[PDB]
Amino acid sequence: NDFYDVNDFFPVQVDGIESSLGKYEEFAKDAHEWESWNLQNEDHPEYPVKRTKIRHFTLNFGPQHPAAHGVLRLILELHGEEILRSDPHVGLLHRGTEKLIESKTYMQALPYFDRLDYVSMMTNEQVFSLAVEKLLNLEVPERGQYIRTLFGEITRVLNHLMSVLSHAMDVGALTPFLWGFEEREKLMEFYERVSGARLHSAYVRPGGVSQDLPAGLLDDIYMWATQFGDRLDETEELLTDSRIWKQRTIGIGEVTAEDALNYGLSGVMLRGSGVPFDIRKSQPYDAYDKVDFDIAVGTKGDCYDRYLIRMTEFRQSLRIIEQCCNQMPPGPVKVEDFKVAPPPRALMKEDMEALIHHFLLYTKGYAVPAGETYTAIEAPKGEMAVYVVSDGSERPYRCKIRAPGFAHLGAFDHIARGHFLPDAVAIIGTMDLVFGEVDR
Amino acid sequence: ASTLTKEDVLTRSVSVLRGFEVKTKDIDLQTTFVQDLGMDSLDLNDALVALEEEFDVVFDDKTANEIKTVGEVVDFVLANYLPTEQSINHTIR
Amino acid sequence: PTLALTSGSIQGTHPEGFRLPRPKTWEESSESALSKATKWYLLSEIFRGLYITLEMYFRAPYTIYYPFEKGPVSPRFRGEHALRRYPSGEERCIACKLCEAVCPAQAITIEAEERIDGSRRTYKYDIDMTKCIYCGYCQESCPVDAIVETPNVEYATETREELLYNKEKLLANGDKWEQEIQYALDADAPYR
Amino acid sequence: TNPTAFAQTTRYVKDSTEMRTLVLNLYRRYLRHSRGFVNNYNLDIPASQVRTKIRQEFERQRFVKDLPLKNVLYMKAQMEFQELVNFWKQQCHVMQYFESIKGDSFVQKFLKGAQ
Amino acid sequence: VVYNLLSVRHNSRIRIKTYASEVSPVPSVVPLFQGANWFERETYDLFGIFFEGHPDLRRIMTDYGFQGHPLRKDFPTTGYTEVRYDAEKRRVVYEPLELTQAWRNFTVGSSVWEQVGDGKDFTPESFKL
Amino acid sequence: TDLAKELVSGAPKELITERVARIYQETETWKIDWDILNKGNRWENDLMGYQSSSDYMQGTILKFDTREGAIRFAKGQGWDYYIQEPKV
Amino acid sequence: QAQEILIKANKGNPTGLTGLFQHPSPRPTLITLYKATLKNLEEKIPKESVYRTAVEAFTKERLSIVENNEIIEDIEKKIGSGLVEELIVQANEEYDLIDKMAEWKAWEELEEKPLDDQWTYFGKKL
Amino acid sequence: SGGPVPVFKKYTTGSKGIWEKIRQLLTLVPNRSTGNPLVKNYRVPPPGYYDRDHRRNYPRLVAFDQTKVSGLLTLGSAQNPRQSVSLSSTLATIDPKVVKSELLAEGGSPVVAPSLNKKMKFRLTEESEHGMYPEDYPIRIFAQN
Ligand SMILES: CCCCCCCCCCCC(=O)OC[C@H](COP(=O)(O)OCC[N+](C)(C)C)OC(=O)CCCCCCCCCCC
Ligand code: SF4
Ligand code: SF4
Numbered sequence A: 001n002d003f004y005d006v007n008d009f010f011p012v013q014v015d016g017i018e019s020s021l022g023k024y025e026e027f028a029k030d031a032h033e034w035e036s037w038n039l040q041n042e043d044h045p046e047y048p049v050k051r052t053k054i055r056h057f058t059l060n061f062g063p064q065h066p067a068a069h070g071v072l073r074l075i076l077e078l079h080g081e082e083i084l085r086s087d088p089h090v091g092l093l094h095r096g097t098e099k100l101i102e103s104k105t106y107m108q109a110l111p112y113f114d115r116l117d118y119v120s121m122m123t124n125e126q127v128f129s130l131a132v133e134k135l136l137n138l139e140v141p142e143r144g145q146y147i148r149t150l151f152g153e154i155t156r157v158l159n160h161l162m163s164v165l166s167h168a169m170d171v172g173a174l175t176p177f178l179w180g181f182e183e184r185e186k187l188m189e190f191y192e193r194v195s196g197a198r199l200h201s202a203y204v205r206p207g208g209v210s211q212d213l214p215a216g217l218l219d220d221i222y223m224w225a226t227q228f229g230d231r232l233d234e235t236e237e238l239l240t241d242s243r244i245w246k247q248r249t250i251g252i253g254e255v256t257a258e259d260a261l262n263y264g265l266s267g268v269m270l271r272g273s274g275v276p277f278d279i280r281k282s283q284p285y286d287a288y289d290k291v292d293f294d295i296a297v298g299t300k301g302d303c304y305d306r307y308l309i310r311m312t313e314f315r316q317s318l319r320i321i322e323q324c325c326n327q328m329p330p331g332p333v334k335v336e337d338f339k340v341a342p343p344p345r346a347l348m349k350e351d352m353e354a355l356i357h358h359f360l361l362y363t364k365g366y367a368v369p370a371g372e373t374y375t376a377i378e379a380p381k382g383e384m385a386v387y388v389v390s391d392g393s394e395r396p397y398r399c400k401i402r403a404p405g406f407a408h409l410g411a412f413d414h415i416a417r418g419h420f421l422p423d424a425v426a427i428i429g430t431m432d433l434v435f436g437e438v439d440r
Numbered sequence B: 001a002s003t004l005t006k007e008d009v010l011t012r013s014v015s016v017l018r019g020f021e022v023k024t025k026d027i028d029l030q031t032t033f034v035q036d037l038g039m040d041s042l043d044l045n046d047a048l049v050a051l052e053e054e055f056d057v058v059f060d061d062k063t064a065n066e067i068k069t070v071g072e073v074v075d076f077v078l079a080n081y082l083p084t085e086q087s088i089n090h091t092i093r
Numbered sequence C: 001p002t003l004a005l006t007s008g009s010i011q012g013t014h015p016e017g018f019r020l021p022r023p024k025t026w027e028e029s030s031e032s033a034l035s036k037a038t039k040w041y042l043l044s045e046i047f048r049g050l051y052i053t054l055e056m057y058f059r060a061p062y063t064i065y066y067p068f069e070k071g072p073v074s075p076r077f078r079g080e081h082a083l084r085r086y087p088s089g090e091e092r093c094i095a096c097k098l099c100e101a102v103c104p105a106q107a108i109t110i111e112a113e114e115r116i117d118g119s120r121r122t123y124k125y126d127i128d129m130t131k132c133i134y135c136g137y138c139q140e141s142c143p144v145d146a147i148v149e150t151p152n153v154e155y156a157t158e159t160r161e162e163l164l165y166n167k168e169k170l171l172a173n174g175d176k177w178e179q180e181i182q183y184a185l186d187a188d189a190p191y192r
Numbered sequence D: 001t002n003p004t005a006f007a008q009t010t011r012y013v014k015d016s017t018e019m020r021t022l023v024l025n026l027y028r029r030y031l032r033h034s035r036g037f038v039n040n041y042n043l044d045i046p047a048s049q050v051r052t053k054i055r056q057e058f059e060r061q062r063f064v065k066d067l068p069l070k071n072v073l074y075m076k077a078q079m080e081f082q083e084l085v086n087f088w089k090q091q092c093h094v095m096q097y098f099e100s101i102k103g104d105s106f107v108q109k110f111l112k113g114a115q
Numbered sequence E: 001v002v003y004n005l006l007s008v009r010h011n012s013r014i015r016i017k018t019y020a021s022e023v024s025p026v027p028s029v030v031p032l033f034q035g036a037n038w039f040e041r042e043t044y045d046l047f048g049i050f051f052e053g054h055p056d057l058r059r060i061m062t063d064y065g066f067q068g069h070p071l072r073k074d075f076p077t078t079g080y081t082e083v084r085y086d087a088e089k090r091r092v093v094y095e096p097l098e099l100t101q102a103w104r105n106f107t108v109g110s111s112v113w114e115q116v117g118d119g120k121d122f123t124p125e126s127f128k129l
Numbered sequence F: 001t002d003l004a005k006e007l008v009s010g011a012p013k014e015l016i017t018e019r020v021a022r023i024y025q026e027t028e029t030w031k032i033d034w035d036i037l038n039k040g041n042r043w044e045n046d047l048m049g050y051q052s053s054s055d056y057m058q059g060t061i062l063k064f065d066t067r068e069g070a071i072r073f074a075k076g077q078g079w080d081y082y083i084q085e086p087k088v
Numbered sequence G: 001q002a003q004e005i006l007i008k009a010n011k012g013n014p015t016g017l018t019g020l021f022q023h024p025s026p027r028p029t030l031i032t033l034y035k036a037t038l039k040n041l042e043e044k045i046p047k048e049s050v051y052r053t054a055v056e057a058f059t060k061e062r063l064s065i066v067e068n069n070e071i072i073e074d075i076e077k078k079i080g081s082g083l084v085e086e087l088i089v090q091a092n093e094e095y096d097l098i099d100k101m102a103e104w105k106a107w108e109e110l111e112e113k114p115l116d117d118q119w120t121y122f123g124k125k126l
Numbered sequence H: 001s002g003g004p005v006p007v008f009k010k011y012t013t014g015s016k017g018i019w020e021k022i023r024q025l026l027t028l029v030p031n032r033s034t035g036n037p038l039v040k041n042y043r044v045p046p047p048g049y050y051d052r053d054h055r056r057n058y059p060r061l062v063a064f065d066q067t068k069v070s071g072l073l074t075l076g077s078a079q080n081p082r083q084s085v086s087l088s089s090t091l092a093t094i095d096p097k098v099v100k101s102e103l104l105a106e107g108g109s110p111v112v113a114p115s116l117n118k119k120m121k122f123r124l125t126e127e128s129e130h131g132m133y134p135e136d137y138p139i140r141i142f143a144q145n
Helices: A097-101 A121-136 A142-171 A173-195 A217-238 A243-249 A257-262 A303-328 A352-363 A404-410 A412-416 A421-431 B006-017 B041-055 B070-079 C032-041 C044-056 C096-104 C137-141 C168-175 C178-187 D015-030 D036-039 D047-060 D067-084 D089-098 D106-112 E034-047 F013-017 F066-076 G026-044 G050-068 G072-079 G084-104 H020-027 H066-074 H086-091 H095-103
Strands: A060-061 A072-079 A082-089 A295-298 A371-378 A383-390 A396-402 C082-084 C106-114 C120-126 C148-149 E004-007 E013-017 E081-086 E091-096 F023-026 F031-034 F082-085 G017-021 H139-143
Touching: A072 A396, A072 A421, A082 A412, A082 A421, A097 A396, A121 A142, A121 A383, A142 A173, A142 A217, A142 A243, A173 A217, A217 A303, A217 C044, A217 E091, A243 A303, A243 A421, A243 C044, A257 G017, A303 H139, A352 C096, A371 E013, A383 E004, A396 A404, A404 A412, A404 A421, A404 E034, A412 A421, B006 B041, B006 B070, B041 B070, B041 C106, B041 D015, B041 D047, B041 F023, B041 G084, C032 C044, C044 D015, C082 C168, C096 C106, C096 C137, C120 C168, C120 G017, C137 C148, C137 E013, C168 C178, D015 D036, D015 D047, D015 D067, D015 G050, D036 D047, D036 D089, D047 D089, D089 E091, F023 F066, F031 F066, G017 G084, G026 G050, G026 G084, G050 G084, G050 H095, G072 G084, H066 H086, H066 H095
Parallel strands: F023 F082
Antiparallel strands: A060 A072, A072 A082, A295 H139, A371 A383, A383 A396, C082 C148, C106 C120, E004 E013, E081 E091, F023 F031
16 A cells, blocks of 8 residues: 555465374464464465555755756655656746746847856847747848857857766866866857857847947957867867766666657757757758758767767867858848837937837837747757747737757656666766756 | 454444544444444544554555445454564564 | 658658668777777876876966956946936936836836926936846937946945945946946947 | 656546545545654644644535536645655645634724725 | 647658647647656646646646646736745745835837738648639 | 636635726727725835835736627636726 | 567667667568558558558558568668668558557548637637 | 868967977877967957838738638649538548549659758768767768768
8 A cells, every 4th residue: 555565385275283282272372472383484475564665765966966057856766876766856947937028028038038048048049039030021131140150159169068068077077177167258258249248148139130240259259269179179188088987978878769759859869869860950040051060970879979979069060160250241230120120329310210210119119920930949958949929919929938958857767767876967967957948 | 463353453443433523422343434423424534544543554445435334444454454564673682 | 753652751861871880899809909908907098188187287377366357348248237427417318218118127217207497307217236137228228328337347235225226326327437438338339 | 757656647537426436535645644744844733733634624625516627626636645745845835834824894994904 | 739749750840739728638648759748747837737648747847835827818927925034933934925116017008000911922822712 | 607717727815806807998809907906006115116016916917809708708717807898 | 360570679780770779681571561551451441531542652652662672772762761670660650550540530520620719819810 | 171280370379489399299289279368469459111021021821721621622723723611521522533633742642741951961971071080989970961
């Protein structure tokens, strides 16, 4: 039952027990003291053993753990050191973003998306910008889509540095964490020069970007590109061929390609299992068709494979950054429609038509024609998509966000079952969890 | 071993039954539960759970709708009484 | 013609050589048994890993010395909200309530009336800096550049009450940071 | 995937009588864990008090009539059982669960402000 | 209730859309996809939709013991209660909602005119009468 | 209509009894909102003049499509309500 | 008749995709299972059901192309639906659907008709 | 092509004097930079209507139910002409030669699910091309061909 619980040899009929001084029944009322007179052997499988159900050691991999990328009450049920069942408790960071967007305009709802994933900002707001652009039936000009491709790559480098190095740090390699974080400081300079804030760059707005690139940014972006090429090499020096790094990750968290599709995994934990699918290729967008790059596909579906794919994503992203700097076109950076973009300040105070649209954009907002859409992009974690329903109003009606880290954490039970408690950290690290995105 | 006999269950059963609102204070094997004591669903469950707390025997879902008399519970405990397993310290030393 | 006859696609066609080759066995390893044992027993990759770390020991650290030095800032930096002022002294702000409408976090509180001289101004202008997200729509919404975000960030306070900026606190910053805001605007004029 | 302790499939029961028996077993399950709820959450009220409050909870809403709304009330009460037995709610929430709770004349409400 | 599907093989997506009421159950897609075990729990938690056949359906995004399903239209955006610390009780206690500044509603000055019309048709002529 | 759905919506007890919802029409669709509280709807905060409030339904408005659709909803939730017919 | 068809192996050489071992004798086993599919249509699914016509349109097409080609590579390339191991999966799970689809009787009229207002979004008819 | 590049072609702090030759003897890879940016070049100067309208012409929202679906097989098409009108009865009594051109494509062959991008064609690459890991590493590199 709920609180406690209760054959090969032949069932042998023995009756008529006798001793040398009488029968079994003659001394029955006295033999309980005589331990050598008992008739219930203790080796019998049918012997009544009633033992209380003492629950197994359930350690809380709870919020106050450095391995956690947020506040995760990972209720782990373990016997010994193996993993029996895992039940993550997401929601400790449910800020209710989906509820708040319904009451704010399409321009005011953009800064919510930078706060989903703390590290992949300009990719997050790109998927809402594309969603609104798809409904608005307006297309960003060429130079706008090249800026989104360049900062699409820089964001991927920023995200993967947080993902790979913390995964390396959580294993125990402290040094590669600090070498890479200087590069993030160097990369966050580029975010701050174009947008103003280091981390949450409300830059990619529906209808292009916020402001044109500052002069000389390309020179500084390219100069970092030459130096950055060595940074991966030293990262691959202390991780790629080290035997301790291989032992911690090889064969840890095996995910079949057929089973990865079943749980809807996307991103690195779908090419780690061998499927050569990539959203940047399946649905080209924002000047990704123009550039050329090679996708990476694993063969064993374990953490070490996903590491190699993520490291390859560094060089392939750096490959595009060279192409985006070289192939940069001239022109505007946002759609030249005053109804979906603020007019320049030189013209707002000179032209009566310009001032009216500036006044009207910021008080009522632009109205999105009715419809519904589901646009998915290759986020650094995986397939990130938003389901947006337009009710002809200047405020979206329904905004459901597909978080790649949300689905992956669900497949923790399928992946981590049968591994050891140290392998739990490796599995979490390779999932690239950011519980702001999980609990959107 | 199972040290409970039929009388031991019967004698201690009344005291628990004397602790709950019963139409008559005369309860024996023939006494019913729903009829004699006027107990409905929720009233009867508390007494049945209470006997689980004293006799330390769990009643399953099959017998739930099939309990009609108090003699059955008294006889049921004997068929379903075991001593909890004692740790290695208690058993042999 | 496509493979729709067979219910297939050119997409479903895996590339030539997609399938894996046969895995190696113990007799098909290039490095002899002694060669692999020496790398294994003598810790060849760990010692190389140690040396590369020792290279960084003879390099200049990136560390800067706060507060004696600061990190770089850009003219677009979004920091402390501040209320600007004309050179003639009259307030730039004419109380649109464009401020109260755009603010995504609803951190702007404006109440206005006719001044004594009749020119339209505001007597209440409060920012809940604990509610603001430093989004930047302050600066973009102004048709007279009355509200701007200074490049300041070092204004942490002991009591949270000090983080509710009324009009006078905003005007004090506007005068106190005026020359710095001149650097920011005149260096970001072309791109707006 | 392996479902957690004390889980049941979400099923749309299409019988009036079966739902009656499902509830009755459920009420016993709460009473069986009466001692645990005191020891797990360190509640100030003794075991008999919890059963008294549980009975006040079960007695309260026994007169519902809609079967489509019977399953919903049985589904969510199952979650309350599962959350409590698995020791998921924090200590504070259970203490405040039992710590919740006659009106006043019109003059009394008029003076202070009513609602 | 929506269902977005992905075909890695044929490189396409589909959208199964089945309605649901506050009481009419929806069959669970766990026997087909185990990946909706967490996507359905979010939908139940934020809407109250009853999913028929879910192996384990419960709260996944709201607080333990939370009352109400938030993403409904009748559910207020600020909620019904908020918590604080009460020194005398020596614990963090729920309490009825109180706002020092209420959520100002700016939708009143919305558009009174029409914004967008029918548009331009693009239906391929093979799918017309 | 006959269903006591209030036991599944999780709404507080005060919505069923002590609150009144108006079904009005501002020019092609109908809306529902709750009438203001007697006291405590809006009191001036004595610190910074913020418009404080204890009513949690002040910011809620539901955009409907047809009148009978709105009435169906109000009966479904067990809401007290009244209907304001627009002037022609 | 008690038969056993090997759907996917549990050991041997990998096939790029994880957890998908190389099938020992795929080509006749594909031919057998493809043939068994056409037998299942003739017993369960009615004639007018376009699902029945859609199965044969590619089962006969593919199964014929398999027999002529004696190289495993050429079977994949002309069919163009992935590996040989995957082609087994596509044939097998399609076979089960023929059993299930007949059980559903998905060739009949619309079982449940939607209400009037159900599929109209924000007043304007879709 | 991202081949190896010397230290003096990377905008970084270098080595001046004999220390350069000391560095090239001790360091394992002499063509890696220290990573510190060039103070003399990096960030040296600081940063201090109808013809053009498409939103109003957005594609319309048209839903096709069983009533309108049946009309395409019987009446034909608005390009190639040939209440509750249920489809199930129409499929029970209609010419299969209508099916093999309207309801199906290429002689009754089922329509493969439409690709979101046709030109997603992959080819397997080799080490000498992409400069990545050698073969023994358990990944493979794909390209757009
Ligand atoms: C006669 C020769 C005498 C040599 C004496 C020295 C032997 C030392 C151990 C060799 C074997 C070994 O390190 O083995 C590696 C073991 C076990 O690896 P495994 O389970 O077999 O997996 C490998 C399977 N292979 C064979 C397929 C590759 O794990 C380790 O990574 C241990 C890492 C130890 C790191 C210690 C760092 C200390 C640095 C000290 C200076 C700063
Ligand atoms: S910076 Fe943005 S969020 Fe902050 S007060 Fe100004 S408008 Fe509001
Ligand atoms: S936009 Fe400028 S002028 Fe208008 S209210 Fe804000 S600060 Fe004042």
